[PDB]
Design a protein around this nucleic acid. Structure first.
Ligand SMILES: [Zn+2]
Lengths: 18, 13, 108, 57
RNA sequence: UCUUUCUCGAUUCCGUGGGUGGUGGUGCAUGGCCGUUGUUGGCUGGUUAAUUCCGAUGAACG
């Protein structure tokens, strides 16, 4: 897990990595 | 005194 | 009612429970595991238009009618990011993961 | 005799012929792995099924 | 492969460019690694004439 992100401008799919 | 025949029955290394 | 349908198909994509295509939709329908079905209204051949709700009523499955198919197809993830734009006429949500309650008491 | 690639025939609604109106037009496979939904292929002299080759002639 | 529809279903498949190009081929530099440039000790099994055949099964000194 990281600390920063792309922050804004929405999301499309959270992705299933597990 | 038993289970010696059971010990010898196990034929493996 | 479309936004609730959009979020329930989105969470179907999240949980990978939906089946795309009339073949996979019918296989989910007749095997008694389906929860809801979605049918596009922009169809030319009328042979498969009338039998889908017959299958839904025979197995006690609820149905939602949408006017467009390409919008339904790009919502359910038939496009890659989009260059290729394709749309489906029928899709069945076999299982779910707020507005789904709105959908289920809209059914009643 | 060039290396032509075979094209699958886009049959129009091959799904919508195993059910009427309710029941199954074709038979059901009695197999353990699958069945009752895997439609039983009935050709003009024979039969053909999906996975574990439960075939009747 | 040539007819007959059963199944897996995005893992897609048809054509065109002198523009890149790929299990590409080949030559140069390149990190590790083999080998290359003394002395003294120490048997469950089947099988054949035979401690027979196959089959599991260590240490110091210069
Ligand atoms: Zn069958």
């Amino acid at each position: 897990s990281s600390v920063m992100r792309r922050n804004e401008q929405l999301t499309l799919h959270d992705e299933r990595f597990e | 005194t038993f289970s010696k025949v059971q010990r010898f029955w196990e034929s493996n290394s | 009612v479309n936004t609730a349908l959009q979020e329930v198909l989105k969470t179907a994509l999240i949980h990978d429970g939906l089946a795309r295509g009339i073949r996979e939709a019918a296989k989910a329908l007749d095997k008694r595991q389906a929860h809801l079905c979605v049918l596009a209204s922009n169809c030319d051949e009328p042979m498969y238009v009338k039998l889908v709700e017959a299958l839904c009523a025979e197995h006690q499955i609820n149905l939602i009618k949408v006017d467009d198919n390409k919008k339904l197809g790009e919502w359910v993830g038939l496009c890659k990011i989009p260059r290729k734009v394709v749309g489906c006429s029928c899709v069945v949500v076999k299982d779910y993961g707020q507005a789904k309650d709105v959908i289920e008491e809209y059914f009643k | 005799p060039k290396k032509n690639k075979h094209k699958r025939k886009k049959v129009k609604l091959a799904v919508l012929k195993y059910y009427k109106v309710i029941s199954r037009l074709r038979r059901e496979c009695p197999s353990d792995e699958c069945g009752a939904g895997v439609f039983m292929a009935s050709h003009f002299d024979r039969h053909y099924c999906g996975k574990c080759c439960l075939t009747y002639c």
